[PDB]
Amino acid sequence: FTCPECRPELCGDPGYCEYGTTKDACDCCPVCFQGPGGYCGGPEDVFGICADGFACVPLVDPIVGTCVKIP
Amino acid sequence: FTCPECRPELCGDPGYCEYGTTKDACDCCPVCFQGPGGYCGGPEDVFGICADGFACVPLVGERDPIVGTCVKIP
């Protein structure tokens, strides 16, 4: 999949990001990090992006996982 | 892409939506709708899902999922 030219004004606000903020797969719109134990991954990380210090660990093609703290 | 079995306990809090709540492309986790003029579409609607009363219309120059913006439809 290929990304459009980013127009930040078209991005919806992410709300308060309890676990921190990052940008979407196109490096365009702000999105909230997923917290521990929550879904992550899938195409373009549609089901969530784990916060710094956390890894998307596969559920027991783009893998789907949950966010788990990296020890 | 094939969805996993939905386990709602693994869903995050979507937050308080300006434009109402819907479910994700897997009909699993709650997510907030995108409103008029905001991005929409892409794989599994990663860039947005348009609110009721609006549809995702492709960006100008796009060719054969599409990315678009939400536009009020007849």
UniProtKB/Swiss-Prot annotation, chain B:
Keywords: Disulfide bond, Glycoprotein, Immunity, Innate immunity, Secreted, Signal. GO terms for biological process: innate immune response; regulation of cell growth; regulation of signal transduction. Residues 1-73 form the IGFBP N-terminal domain. It is found in: Secreted. Glycans are attached at residue 2. GO terms for molecular function: insulin-like growth factor binding. Disulfide bonds join 3-26, 6-28, 11-29, 17-32, 40-56, 50-70. GO terms for cellular component: extracellular region. Expressed in hemocytes. Has a role in the innate immune system. Does not reveal bactericidal activities against E.coli and S.aureus. This is Single insulin-like growth factor-binding domain protein-1. It comes from Cupiennius salei (American wandering spider). The lineage of its organism: Eukaryota, Metazoa, Ecdysozoa, Arthropoda, Chelicerata.
